[PDB]
Amino acid sequence: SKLKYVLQDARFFLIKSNNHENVSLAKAKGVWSTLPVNEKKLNLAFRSARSVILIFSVRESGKFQGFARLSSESHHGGSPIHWVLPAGMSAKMLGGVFKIDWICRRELPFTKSAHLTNPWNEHKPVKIGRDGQEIELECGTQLCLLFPPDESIDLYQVIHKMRH
Amino acid sequence: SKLKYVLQDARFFLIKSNNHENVSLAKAKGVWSTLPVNEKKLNLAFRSARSVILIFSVRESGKFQGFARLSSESHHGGSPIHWVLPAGMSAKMLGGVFKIDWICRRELPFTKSAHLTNPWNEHKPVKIGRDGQEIELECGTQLCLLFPPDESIDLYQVIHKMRH
Amino acid sequence: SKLKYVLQDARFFLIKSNNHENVSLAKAKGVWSTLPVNEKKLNLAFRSARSVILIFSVRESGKFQGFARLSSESHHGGSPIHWVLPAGMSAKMLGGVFKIDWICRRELPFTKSAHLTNPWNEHKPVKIGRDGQEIELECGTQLCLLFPPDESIDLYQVIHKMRH
Amino acid sequence: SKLKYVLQDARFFLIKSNNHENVSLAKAKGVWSTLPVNEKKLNLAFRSARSVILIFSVRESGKFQGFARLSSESHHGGSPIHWVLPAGMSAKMLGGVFKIDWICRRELPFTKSAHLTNPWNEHKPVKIGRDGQEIELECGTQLCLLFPPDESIDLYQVIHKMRH
Ligand SMILES: O=C(Nc1ccc(-c2cncs2)cc1)c1cc(C(=O)c2ccccc2C(F)(F)F)c[nH]1
Ligand SMILES: O=C(Nc1ccc(-c2cncs2)cc1)c1cc(C(=O)c2ccccc2C(F)(F)F)c[nH]1
Ligand SMILES: O=C(Nc1ccc(-c2cncs2)cc1)c1cc(C(=O)c2ccccc2C(F)(F)F)c[nH]1
Ligand SMILES: O=C(Nc1ccc(-c2cncs2)cc1)c1cc(C(=O)c2ccccc2C(F)(F)F)c[nH]1
Known part of the structure; x- marks a missing residue:
């Protein structure tokens, strides 16, 4: 429920890095x-x-x-x-530099998202897209729910920093 | 007095544009x-x-x-x-874009600042400097006081936007 | 033999593109x-x-x-x-723009180069590397020899444009 | 005559630098x-x-x-x-880097070109223009002829490097 609250009415962007170091x-x-x-x-x-x-x-x-x-x-x-x-x-x-609040730092293989398609990218699989491709609300919500829960993250700290 | 209040403890930068259109x-x-x-x-x-x-x-x-x-x-x-x-x-x-509050939109010819030198640029005349050259506090204050007062500007609106 | 002639003493660079369009x-x-x-x-x-x-x-x-x-x-x-x-x-x-003389326009899957490691990139498989990674002479030669012959290409035209 | 030969049918560009160092x-x-x-x-x-x-x-x-x-x-x-x-x-x-063959390294003050207007820049004095402004053939020719002869330059060396 906490993850779904965080994701309510969100916009989603697929961010592609050429290397692991920037994500680390x-x-x-x-x-x-x-x-x-x-x-x-x-x-x-x-x-x-x-x-x-x-x-x-x-x-x-x-x-x-x-x-x-x-x-x-x-x-x-x-x-x-x-x-x-x-x-x-x-x-x-x-x-400039954006501060980001991590919700999940665990990996999800593309094999596990193979059933989801992005209506905002011609219904191609959600892994497919140029850097910055926007993911439609319901598709992006389902993709995020596929990740394993990250016990190292306190979602209350994420929710507290929200200012909507 | 109002101008001097605005200038108190300020930092000053000389901004050089290649053309008039950007300043306009x-x-x-x-x-x-x-x-x-x-x-x-x-x-x-x-x-x-x-x-x-x-x-x-x-x-x-x-x-x-x-x-x-x-x-x-x-x-x-x-x-x-x-x-x-x-x-x-x-x-x-x-x-990104900075919002700026104009204090004087009137011109000052270099001939009128010829007596001021910038200690932070080897005491060269204050007109001399690369884009972004910083002007020492007292020199920058004197330079600003040389401009003609701009009656089209309400310094109270400038002072009100200050958040020190 | 024609391919080996073109490759004699060559330098090899791995060029990584993020889209198919640029390579097409x-x-x-x-x-x-x-x-x-x-x-x-x-x-x-x-x-x-x-x-x-x-x-x-x-x-x-x-x-x-x-x-x-x-x-x-x-x-x-x-x-x-x-x-x-x-x-x-x-x-x-x-x-600017470089003129390039294609030698092979056919694809080679990474699975076919699994035995080639690049000694100028810590002996990692030759598929691995940042954009522009240089490939040691013999490794690059063997990688190019793994590609299927490209009958659509006249290697004499490539050879005739060499000016060594 | 040597200068006029070099300038025949030439194109002229006004190059504006913000510092002396680059021109030096x-x-x-x-x-x-x-x-x-x-x-x-x-x-x-x-x-x-x-x-x-x-x-x-x-x-x-x-x-x-x-x-x-x-x-x-x-x-x-x-x-x-x-x-x-x-x-x-x-x-x-x-x-990249262009090789240039200096024809005159001596200065010409703007006061000496006050009579030359550039018809490809709205008949403004030829000193006026953004970086890269092109100067019409006859105006550019006359501007170059206004410079003092530069004995330190061998115009034969300039002429011999022409490949027209
Ligand atoms: O943020 C990224 N891309 C983006 C593209 C489009 C849009 C949008 C378009 N429309 C609405 S949002 C939003 C974000 C983006 C960043 C990277 C990096 O690896 C990276 C990270 C940090 C520093 C330098 C780099 C580096 F310089 F190496 F790239 C990849 N991607
Ligand atoms: O803000 C400028 N320069 C600056 C340099 C150094 C420093 C500092 C260094 N250290 C501490 S502050 C601060 C400001 C600066 C801007 C311009 C323009 O004409 C201009 C204006 C708006 C858009 C695009 C341009 C254009 F693209 F055309 F340039 C000239 N100058
Ligand atoms: O040429 C590339 N990279 C390179 C890196 C390092 C070195 C070397 C380093 N040391 C010795 S050589 C040589 C080449 C390189 C180009 C691309 C493109 O997709 C591409 C293609 C054409 C236009 C614009 C782009 C785009 F803007 F999209 F990138 C990816 N890679
Ligand atoms: O070459 C320049 N400008 C140009 C503009 C337009 C056109 C043309 C347009 N149409 C036909 S030609 C040709 C030349 C130009 C260069 C400079 C420099 O000071 C300079 C010099 C060397 C290195 C770096 C710089 C620096 F980075 F500092 F700028 C000013 N100007």
Whole structure:
């Protein structure tokens, strides 16, 4: 029930990382960053929706690595984070830093989501999509409910940080 | 006295634009933008100082065009603004949008500031500096006091938006 | 023998694309592009090595899609190419265009290269690597020899464009 | 006569730098660089025009610092060049390096060109223009002829590098 409360009326985005290190840093530090165009879209979504849920997948892994709620709009951030940037990209191109509240840090293999389709991506399987693909409400809710419950996470701390 | 109150313990930055259009848009809309690296520095300065004052100069103009107080940290912004970007730069590289409260929208020719030197730039005349050059407290205060008073601006509205 | 001739003393790079579209365009038009940092690295490699071989893999495909020889240093480009760019990145950030001479446009599944490890990447299977990972001479040679012969390609045309 | 020969049928571009350092480096090393969008435009102009002439002006200097002929399309570069970059921009964003053949390294004050208007920029004085502004043939020719002869330059070396 607590997870479903967190997910009520949420918007869902599929976030694809080229490597494991960025998702590991996000789990360790509770933060996320991206290019300004995407940052703008996330900030708009954050102000417009009861919750914004990021569902993370490392390409070539065949799995989702967890999901998290946007905790606030982006801000300047602290000391540099050693993100692993795509070949040739300068860290000077990154925007601000989002604080994220992890709801599940456990993995879900794509084999377990093979029955779900995203109406907002031509009913392709929900694993399929470009970085930032939005997942329709009911599909995104079912996908999140497929993850194993994460006993290392206190959903009350997630619920307390909600300001809807 | 009101202007001096606004300037108390402020930090001052010299902001140089390649063209008039960006400063005109900033006066019309009460906003400013820049690349993320600079945005980060302005956001940090905003949280650290009683006031952050931007002093604007259009290159090749021989003048300052006015000065404004940072009103808040940067945010996603509204509809695109038709900023005039340097040749070859994508608007996708810009960070968020700062709201600024204009304190003076009138010009000051460089000839009138020729007696002031910036200790934080090797005592070069205060007109001299790369974009973002910081101006020492007393020098920056004297420079702002050289501008003609702007009767079109209500300093009470500036003072009311201060949250120190 | 013709393939082994082209590959003599070659340098090999694993090129990872996040979508099929860019590799399909490269196959149709015989060109490639990327960010200026990587463009510089490819131009340096082209000028010094007898051949530079790009081995392409679309992430999440579980296959290599083919491989090609760099035919020239990068140049202006000519006609526009509707590359698919990472979210939030501008085509204005891209460097010039390389002419590439395809050697094989047929696919090779990762299962077929399970016995090849790359000694310049910690002896990990050669399918593993960040974008641009260099592959040691003998490992890259054997990987290219694993691809099925591509009758649609005239290796004499590839060989005749060599200027060693 | 030698100068008029070099300038026959040339295209002329006004290049505006925000600091003296970049123009000083260009004069010392005989090279130029810029963002890929502008690099593409310069490479196109080089391939089609008999000569491409870059006329340099450091903003706020009130002078042109000299002019040079594009000697080649852009290339990798070679040795590093410690260009001064706009605040917040990364050297990784820059394109390749153009070889330039200086024709005059002596300065021309704007007061000396007050009679030349650029018909491809609304008949504004030729000193006026955004970075990269193209200058009509006869106006650019007369502007270059206004510079003082530069005995330190051997125009035969410039002429011998022409490949029209
Ligand atoms: O946040 C990401 N992407 C996104 C795309 C679109 C949209 C939206 C579009 N429309 C509505 S939301 C939202 C987010 C996004 C980030 C990464 C990283 O690996 C990463 C992480 C941190 C720093 C640097 C990087 C790195 F530079 F390496 F990329 C992959 N993805
Ligand atoms: O804000 C600017 N620069 C800055 C530099 C350094 C620092 C700091 C460094 N350290 C502490 S603060 C702060 C601000 C800055 C902006 C401009 C513009 O013309 C402009 C305006 C709006 C949109 C796009 C642009 C455009 F893209 F065209 F540039 C010039 N300047
Ligand atoms: O060329 C690429 N990468 C590379 C990295 C490192 C090195 C080297 C490092 N050291 C020696 S070589 C060489 C090449 C590279 C390109 C892509 C694309 O999908 C692509 C294709 C065309 C246009 C735009 C893009 C897009 F913008 F979408 F990316 C993925 N990869
Ligand atoms: O080359 C430049 N601009 C250009 C604009 C448009 C066009 C054309 C448009 N249409 C046909 S040609 C051609 C050239 C241009 C370069 C600079 C620099 O100071 C500079 C120099 C070297 C490295 C880095 C920089 C720095 F990063 F600092 F900028 C100013 N300007």
